[PDB]
Design a protein around this ligand. Structure first.
Ligand code: NAG
Ligand code: NAG
Ligand code: NAG
Ligand code: NAG
Ligand code: NAG
Ligand code: NAG
Ligand code: NAG
Ligand code: NAG
Lengths: 215, 215, 215, 215, 215, 215, 215, 215
C-alpha cells in the first residue's frame, strides 16, 4: 500500500512531471500548436505541491512586452489567478494543502472580465471586470513551474518562484467550460478529457533543468 | 489496482515505448538486420493510442523514391493499411478505441495482391489485387509513430502525423502468417513470439525526440 | 510483496538517490540557497548502505583551506561524525547494518562544542568540547556520498571513500533540534519535515557520475 | 501480479541491467579496482535471456593479445565456458531456457585446469586439464553482454554476438568457491553475497549503447 | 606565397565550408527563410573539388515524393545540372579541374524549359524544353555536398555521392539572371552579390558530419 | 594583399566574433560582472555588417518589464540608438556601409536626457531630453547581434532582427566619455582601451547558435 | 617569415592533423571504404614529430587476433616498420629529426616478404623474407598516432605510445609503388597524389581526444 | 604586418592557449604523467596578459590540505611567486607590460629555501629561506589561468582571479635550471626545450570554460 499510495496519480493519468527541487534552471516549456490568442479560456491542472513560498508558479504565459498575460500560482495556502497583468488578480484564500493531489481550474472571459477559480470542482473564487476587453495575444512563451525570465544561463530564473512537487493533466481550452464540464475535468476518470489549446499527452511539454517525466 | 492497471502491458511483454506527445521531432527508428526486400509480409503491433487525428502513423516504411512502401496508420475511427503506394489502401472502418491496448496486425502477399487486416485476432478487413506483383524494396527507412520526412534538421516531421500513446510488440515476418498464428501473436502470453524481420526485444529500436522506453 | 519491499522508501518519502556503485566519479552535489555559515546545526539523513569500507562518506562539507568542516561517514559497523576538523571526531560504535533503511542525524553547537549522534531516533553517542567556539564557514562545497577531491576532470575522487546504496531525506537545520523533534524526523510520516538550510525535495541536489534519482 | 511478475528480480536484488535489443553498439563495461590477474576464479551471474543465437555473450574478459581469456556465453539451449582460449571450452548441453531468470556460475583453477559449470546451484558440467598452468593476465577489458572487439568505431561490435534480456548479480571471486558457497550465491536472499574482484552494486558497471539500469 | 595560395578564397569572400573527406554523414544543410517554390531560378556556387567520382553532389534540392527537384553535381571533368527529375539533365563537358577554384552557375526557366549552365562566367552548355511548365515545389530539403537520403540514422548517406573539397558563395535567385549579371557574380570582388532565395553569409547553412566553416 | 585584408581587424584587436548568418538562434550573450544600473553610459563597438535590413541589432539590453532599455541597431544606411524605450530614439541618417569596419559609440546622460551618436570618431547625431531622469535598471539580459526574445524553445528569436557579419571591441563605460576619449576609443591602436562595465577581452561573451570567436 | 614558417605545410597540402599532446585518449581513426585485405601495399605519410620516445606510433593496423598487422612508428631517431607481427620488423637507423616535416613511406610485398622503407624519397632500409606469404586481413581497426588498445571508457590507450606533433598526407596503396612513384609522392606539389585504399582528403579520418584538424 | 604582428608567437612556438575573458568557469587543467613530488623545481611560461587585477593566476598547484603549494600570479605591476603557502611570497615589483609577450621563470630549492624569479631571462628577484625543508606533495591538481577550487558548481572559480590573454610554453623541470639554461628557455627558438615534469606540447593540457587552443 505504501508504494501504491505514493505512486498514485489522480485521474486515470499515467504520466506526471516531477519537479525534484526548486532551482534557478528547473522549468517546463509548453508548445501549443495553435496560437495562444484568447478572448476567453479555461486552464486546469493537477498539482501536488511539495512546498509553497510567497509565490510558486504553477504555469505562466507571457509576452515580450508583458510577462504576466496569464498566471496561476500558489501563495502559501492561497491560490492566485492573474490575467492581463499583475494588477488583475483573483485570490482564493485558503485552498491548497501540501503533499496531496488537488485539481485547479482557472476560467476567464474578456467580454465582462468575468473570472472564476475552482478547486477540486468547487467554486473557490469569482470576480468580474478583470481585464475587461483585453485580448491575450499569440506569440508568447508558455511555461509550467516557472515564470518567464530566462532559461539561457547567466543566472537563470528566480529560484524562489519555482514549483517543486508533481504536475499532471495541464489543459487549456480556448473557451469557458460550463460548470458541469469543470466538475468533469476533475473526475476520477477525467484524464482523457483534454484541452483544445493545450492537451495533456498531445501538446509537446519539455521538462528542463532537472524536471522529469515520471511515466 | 489502478496503479497496477495504469502500468499493465498487454501480452507478457515487459517493455513498451511511450510517446508522451505528438511533436515535430518525436519518432522511433527501427534497424532490421536483414533486408526489408519483401514479396509477402506480416506486420503486427500493440498500440494504446492517446489521441487520433486524420492520420496518425503507427509504423511506416519508405524509400527515397517512394515514401509509402508500407504504412499502418489510424484515422479517427479506422485502421488504414498501405502497401506499395498511398493509392493502395485497405481500410478497416470502425475498431480502434482510445486508451485501450489493442493488437493490430497486417498481412500482404504480392502474388495476388492479397491483403488482410486483423484487430484483436479477428479478421477486420480483406482485399485482393492490392499492389499485385509489387516487391517492397530494401534500403528504406523504417520508423514507428512517424512517417519519413525531415529528420536531422530542427523538427522536420509533420506534427499532425505523429503517434501519441504507447507501443509494444512491433513484429514483422517475411511471410504471410497463417490465421492460427495470427491469433497466437495476440495471445495472453504471446510476447515471446517475434518476427524474423523485426523482432520486438531483438531488433534495434531507437526512440527519438522525447519517445521513451518504459522498461 | 518482495517487489513492493525492494521499492519501499522509509518515511512518506517518494524519491531517493541511488548510488549503483562506488567509483572515482559518482557523487551528489548539494546547493543550499542560504549560506552554510553555522554556529550550530542538525543534519539528518536516511541511508541504505550497500557496502561499507574503512570510510564511506554519507555527506561532506568543506572549503579550500579545510576539507572537513562537517562530515558524516560510516566505518564498517560504526558511524563517525566530524565537525571543524578530522581531529574533532565523535564515533558511534556499532550502529549501521547493510541493506536496511536507517535514519542518522547529527547535532552540534559551537557554544560548548556539544555534539550528539542519533540512530533511528535513539541517542547513539554524545560528547562535549568538540570544536568549541568554531564557526563553520560559508562558500564551501557540500556533497553527498563523496568528499571534496574530484569534480572537473581526471576521475578525481577516491573510489574507496564513495558511498554505494540509496539515500533520501537529507536535511540540515541551522539549529540544534530538540530531542522530541529528532524523534519526529525519523517518524513513519516525517518526510514533510525538512531543514531550513538543506530541505529534501526543495534544495537543489544534482546526482553525478552514475548517481540517479529514483522516483 | 501482472506487473509484479514482470518486475520481479531473482534474489534480493534491487537493480538489473536491461539489454532492450542486440545491436552493434550495446554493451556493458566493468571496471574492477583490483587487477584481474587470476590463478583461479569463480564467476556467477543471473541472466534472463530474451533470445539466444549461435553465440550470445554473457560476459567476456580479453586482452590485446588474446580476446578470449575468459568467456561465458549461451549457444541456443547450451552454456559454454571458456578460459585461456577458444580451444579451452566446457559445454553444458541443454541448460538455459528463454525468459526465465537462471543463475550461472563458472569456476576454474589453473593448478589442475579443473573447471566446473553450475546452473541454479546444480553442477551442470565439469572438466579437468583446461588451461592447466595458465594465468589470466591483468590489464584486459571486461565486458558484459558483448565481446571485446569493436567499440568507438560507431559501435563496431558484432551484433550477432550481443546479449539481449536482463542481467543482475554479476560477481567474480579470485578463488574457487566451495560447493556450499556456490549454492548460497544462488539463494533466494543471496544478492548481498558479492565477489571480491567484481561485486554487484560495488564495482563500477557502465551500460552503453542503449543498455539501461533498471532500478 | 605558398601559405597565401593555400588560404586564398576566390572572390572577396572571407568564409568557406571545408569538406575534409567524403563519408556517410558529412553534409551541409541550407535553410531558406522564404519558400523554394520556383518557376525560374539561378543557382551559382564556388567549388574547389578535391576528388570527383561518377557523381559528386555540389547541392541538391528534393522533396519527399521527388528527391531530384534540383541538382548540380560533377561527373569527373563533366558538370551535370538537373531540374524536375533525374531524366532532365543539362550536361557540360570537360569543365571542372580538381584543386582549382571555379565558379559554376545554373539557370532555368519553366516557361520554355530554357536551361543554361555557366563556368567561370562563360556559357558552357544550354538546352531548351527541359522540365517545361514544371514548378519546383516548396517544403523540400536543400543540402550542399550531399543528396537527400537518410541523415538521422547513423551515417545513412551514400558516401560515394558526397563532396570533398571547399565551397563558398552558394547563391540562389528566384529569377533568371541576365548574362551580364552572371558574369558579375563570378567577378573578382563579386562575393557581396548574393541571392534573394539563398544568400551566402545570410542564409543559415549548417555543416554536419565533419564539415567545417574555415572562416 | 587580399589574404591579409580579408583577415584584418580594425584596431590592435586580435579577436572578433563572426556571425556567419542571421538565423533564428544565433546571438551573443554578455555577462557584466558589475550591475548594469546606469544613470549615464557610453557604449562603443566595431561592426563589419554583411547585410542590413529594416532593423539589425548590434547590441540590446532589456529587462523582463522592458525589452528596450538600450539598443543600438542598423536600419539600411542608418544607425538607431535607443534608451529607455522604443519611443526614445536617436537616428543617424546615412553612414553605415556594408563590408567595412566602422566604429560606433552611443553616449547618454539621464540628467538632461542628453544623447549623442558617433561614427568613426565624428559626431553623427545628437539630442537633448531623451529618457530624461530615467535610470537603466540592473538585472537585465545584455545580448550582441540579437534582441531579447528567447533562446531555448528551438531558438525562438526573430531571424529578421539578427546581425550578420563580424563584431569586435564591444565596450560599455558607466560614464559619458569626453569627446577626446571617444576619438581615442576609435584610434588605430585603441583596442587596449576597454570599458569598466563591459570590457572587450575581460567581460565574458558567449557566442551561441553558430556565432564563433575568430581568434 | 616565422609566422609563415610556423604554419607551412609540406607538399601542396591544405589540411593537417595536430596532436597537441600525447595523452591516454588522443588518436585518429581511419575508415577505408574498401577492405584492408592486402597482399602488398605502400603506406606513405608526412610527419612533424614534437617529441619521440622509445615507441611513438605514426599509424597502426590490427585485428582482435593480432594488434600488429601493420605498424609504422618512431624510436628516437630510428624508424620502425612492422608487418604481420612485432617479430617482423624493418628498422631504419637514424632518420627522423624533431620539428621538421619529413616524408616517410613504407612498402611491402608478401610474395617474397620484400619490404622497403623510404625517407624524404631516399631508400632508407630494405629487407626480404619479412612476413612471406602472409596476407593482411580485413575487418581490422586502422588508427593514426596511436596503437590498437582500449578506447571506450576503458582508461584509454598507453600514453607513452601516443604521437605528438602534426600529420598530413596519410596514404595507402593496395600495391607496391615503383621507385619513381615513391619519389613523386614526396614531391613539392605531390599532395594531390593519394592512395586507393586510404586517400588523404577523401578517406574519413576522425580526430579524437584533443586531436584537431588544423584547417 | 598588422596580422603578422598580432598572430606572432614568441619562441618557435606554434600553439598557444587563448583566454578570451575572465569568468567563473574558464581555466586550463594540466596532467603530468609523473608525480609532482618536488624538492626543487623550475617553472617557466610565456604570458601575454590582457588585463591584470590584484591577483591574476598564471598557474597554480594545490592539494586538498593546501591550495597554495605553488603559485605564479601577476598583480597590477608585479609578479608574485608562491611556494608552500601564501605566506611564502617572492615579489618582483614592476615588470609585466600588458599586451606584450614576456617570459617568466620561477626557481625554488627546498634545501636552503633558495628561490629566484626571472623575467625575460634577467634575474628579477631572489630570496632565501623560503619554505626551507618543505616538500611539494604528490597528487595535487595543477591548473593554468585559475586557482584551485572545484569547477562544477555552475562555475565555482573566483572570476576576479582568472587569467585573460594568451599563454604558451608552460614548462616545469624537477630541478633548478642553471642561469645559462634559464636564458636559453627564453631564447628566440627555445620552444623545443621543454620541462621533464610538464613539457609544452607533450603534457596533456585541457582548456575549459571557453579557453581555446590557438594552433
Ligand atoms: C507575499 O507576496 C506579496 C506580493 O503580492 C508581498 O507583498 C509580500 O511581501 C509577501 N509576503 C511575505 C510574508 O513576504
Ligand atoms: C481525413 O483524411 C482524408 C484523407 O483520406 C481527407 O481527405 C479529409 O480531409 C480528412 N478529414 C478531415 C476532417 O480533415
Ligand atoms: C580504518 O581507518 C583508520 C583511520 O581512522 C585507519 O587507521 C585504519 O588503517 C583503517 N582500518 C583498516 C583495517 O584498514
Ligand atoms: C554454432 O557455432 C559453431 C561454432 O562453435 C559453428 O560451427 C556453427 O556453424 C553454429 N551453428 C549454426 C547452426 O550456425
Ligand atoms: C556513371 O553513371 C552513369 C549513369 O548516369 C552510367 O551510365 C555509367 O556507366 C557510370 N560509370 C561508371 C564508371 O560508374
Ligand atoms: C523600417 O522601419 C520603420 C520603423 O521605424 C518602419 O516604419 C518601416 O515600415 C520599415 N521600412 C520598410 C521598407 O519596411
Ligand atoms: C626500447 O625498446 C626495446 C624493445 O624494442 C627494448 O629492448 C629497450 O629496453 C628499450 N629502450 C629503452 C631505453 O627503454
Ligand atoms: C592587492 O593585494 C594585496 C595582497 O598582498 C592586498 O594587500 C591589497 O589590498 C590589494 N590591493 C588593492 C588595491 O585592493
Amino acid at each position: 500500500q505504501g508504494w501504491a499510495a505514493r505512486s498514485w496519480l489522480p485521474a486515470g493519468c499515467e504520466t506526471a512531471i516531477l519537479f525534484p527541487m526548486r532551482s534557478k534552471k528547473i522549468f517546463g516549456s509548453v508548445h501549443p500548436v495553435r496560437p495562444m490568442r484568447l478572448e476567453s479560456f479555461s486552464a486546469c491542472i493537477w498539482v501536488k505541491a511539495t512546498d509553497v513560498l510567497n509565490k510558486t508558479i504553477l504555469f505562466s504565459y507571457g509576452t515580450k512586452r508583458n510577462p504576466y498575460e496569464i498566471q496561476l500560482y500558489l501563495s502559501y495556502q492561497s491560490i492566485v489567478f492573474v490575467v492581463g497583468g499583475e494588477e488583475n488578480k483573483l485570490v482564493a484564500e485558503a485552498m491548497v494543502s501540501l503533499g496531496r493531489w488537488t485539481h485547479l481550474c482557472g476560467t476567464w472571459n474578456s467580454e465582462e472580465g468575468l473570472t472564476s477559480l475552482w478547486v477540486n470542482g468547487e467554486l473557490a473564487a469569482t470576480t468580474v471586470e478583470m481585464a475587461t476587453g483585453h485580448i491575450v495575444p499569440e506569440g508568447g512563451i508558455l511555461q509550467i513551474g516557472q515564470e518567464k525570465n530566462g532559461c539561457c544561463v547567466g543566472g537563470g530564473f528566480d529560484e524562489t518562484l519555482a514549483f517543486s512537487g508533481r504536475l499532471t493533466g495541464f489543459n487549456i481550452w480556448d473557451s469557458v467550460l460550463s460548470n458541469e464540464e469543470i466538475r468533469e475535468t476533475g473526475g476520477a476518470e477525467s484524464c482523457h478529457i483534454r484541452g483544445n489549446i493545450v492537451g495533456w499527452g498531445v501538446t509537446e511539454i519539455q521538462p528542463h533543468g532537472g524536471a522529469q517525466y515520471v511515466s
